[PDB]
Amino acid sequence: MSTIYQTSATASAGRNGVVSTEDKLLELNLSYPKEMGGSGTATNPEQLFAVGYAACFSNAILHVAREAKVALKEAPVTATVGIGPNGQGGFALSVALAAHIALEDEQARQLVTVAHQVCPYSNAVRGNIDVQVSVNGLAL
Amino acid sequence: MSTIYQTSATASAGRNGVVSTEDKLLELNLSYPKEMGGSGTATNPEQLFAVGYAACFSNAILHVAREAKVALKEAPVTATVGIGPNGQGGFALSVALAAHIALEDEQARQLVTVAHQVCPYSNAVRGNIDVQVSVNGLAL
Ligand SMILES: [Zn+2]
Ligand SMILES: [Zn+2]
Ligand SMILES: [Zn+2]
Ligand SMILES: [Zn+2]
Ligand SMILES: [Zn+2]
Ligand SMILES: [Zn+2]
Ligand SMILES: [Zn+2]
Ligand SMILES: [Zn+2]
Ligand SMILES: [Zn+2]
Ligand SMILES: [Zn+2]
Ligand SMILES: [Zn+2]
Ligand SMILES: [Zn+2]
């Protein structure tokens, strides 16, 4: 309940315009993808979520492993994020997390399961998005 | 439950390393901020979430207004995202959304309330993160 870091960003043109952090470390153009009738020459909120979750979940694995005294060199995570209508006048995201750890399958599953309890992105979406988690190419 | 757009991104070094989308529209370096013992010269998952939510929530406002036949020129949203320990061995995000609409306060509140039901980012986190929403400088 203490806060170790916080940041702000501002957008005023939704999905078709600029967005930036207050400190300007991230300054981006956004556009609709071709799939949504746009040019596809700029990024979008689904890509931002995919990048953030891939990094944050990879980090969760690294964190849980370090605390368990398990030495990892890398923890590749591919996050796949989709958007579609929810049938209630809005939209919902779908998320798949494909995690990879250079350990035996069960040990890898145990680490990923704990990472999925620790990670703030997983905590944020639990119960709303049914995140589909894979470990080393198999289902969690 | 149909999907209109999906995308993937991959990270293998957590919060201290590169992350990219499959199509390379977003390719980023990440580092811990100074607040977390890092250089502060690269971005992070909290900033990615703040940028994504600011844009997606601004877009929700624009979408709900268009559907209500309310003409808006812009819809500034500042998303403030924090991270801290959750006391259960992991971390949680805090989110504040400061929305702005050039309409009377109550009309603006009504539009924002509906946007907060429609937006896929709001749908993703509802019940887990108590998003603190403001409209035109006042509480929602
Ligand atoms: Zn595309
Ligand atoms: Zn994480
Ligand atoms: Zn850590
Ligand atoms: Zn490897
Ligand atoms: Zn894989
Ligand atoms: Zn399992
Ligand atoms: Zn800082
Ligand atoms: Zn949205
Ligand atoms: Zn729309
Ligand atoms: Zn204005
Ligand atoms: Zn304000
Ligand atoms: Zn109110």
Side-chain angles (χ1 to χ4, degrees), chain A residues 2-140, chain B residues 2-140:
Chain A
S2 67
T3 296
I4 65 178
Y5 170 73
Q6 57 185 313
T7 195
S8 297
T10 302
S12 310
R15 284 168 175 263
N16 290 280
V18 300
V19 60
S20 57
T21 58
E22 184 179 5
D23 66 6
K24 310 294 172 159
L25 273 178
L26 261 182
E27 293 173 284
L28 298 168
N29 296 125
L30 306 179
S31 74
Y32 281 150
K34 293 192 185 196
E35 286 74 18
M36 297 167 35
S39 62
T41 61
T43 195
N44 59 64
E46 290 64 45
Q47 288 197 330
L48 288 158
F49 194 66
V51 168
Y53 205 165
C56 200
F57 199 68
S58 175
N59 198 261
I61 296 169
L62 294 173
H63 177 102
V64 166
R66 177 184 57 71
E67 294 196 328
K69 309 293 185 168
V70 179
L72 302 182
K73 296 210 173 175
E74 56 196 344
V77 173
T78 297
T80 297
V81 177
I83 181 170
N86 66 7
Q88 297 214 293
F91 304 87
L93 301 181
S94 61
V95 180
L97 298 173
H100 308 84
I101 299 175
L103 294 169
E104 294 185 347
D105 295 347
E106 179 59 24
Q107 190 176 14
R109 285 176 164 124
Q110 292 289 113
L111 291 167
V112 172
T113 296
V114 176
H116 197 43
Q117 300 294 304
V118 160
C119 181
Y121 274 57
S122 294
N123 288 143
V125 306
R126 189 170 307 107
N128 296 321
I129 303 184
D130 186 3
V131 180
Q132 305 298 117
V133 187
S134 305
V135 180
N136 296 351
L138 302 168
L140 176 57
Chain B
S2 67
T3 296
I4 65 178
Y5 170 73
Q6 57 185 313
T7 195
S8 297
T10 302
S12 310
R15 284 168 175 263
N16 290 280
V18 300
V19 60
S20 57
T21 58
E22 184 179 5
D23 66 6
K24 310 294 172 159
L25 273 178
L26 261 182
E27 293 173 284
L28 298 168
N29 296 125
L30 306 179
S31 74
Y32 281 150
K34 293 192 185 196
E35 286 74 18
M36 297 167 35
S39 62
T41 61
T43 195
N44 59 64
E46 290 64 45
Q47 288 197 330
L48 288 158
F49 194 66
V51 168
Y53 205 165
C56 200
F57 199 68
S58 175
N59 198 261
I61 296 169
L62 294 173
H63 177 102
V64 166
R66 177 184 57 71
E67 294 196 328
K69 309 293 185 168
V70 179
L72 302 182
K73 296 210 173 175
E74 56 196 344
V77 173
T78 297
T80 297
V81 177
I83 181 170
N86 66 7
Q88 297 214 293
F91 304 87
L93 301 181
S94 61
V95 180
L97 298 173
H100 308 84
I101 299 175
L103 294 169
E104 294 185 347
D105 295 347
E106 179 59 24
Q107 190 176 14
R109 285 176 164 124
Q110 292 289 113
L111 291 167
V112 172
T113 296
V114 176
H116 197 43
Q117 300 294 304
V118 160
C119 181
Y121 274 57
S122 294
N123 288 143
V125 306
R126 189 170 307 107
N128 296 321
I129 303 184
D130 186 3
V131 180
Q132 305 298 117
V133 187
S134 305
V135 180
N136 296 351
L138 302 168
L140 176 57

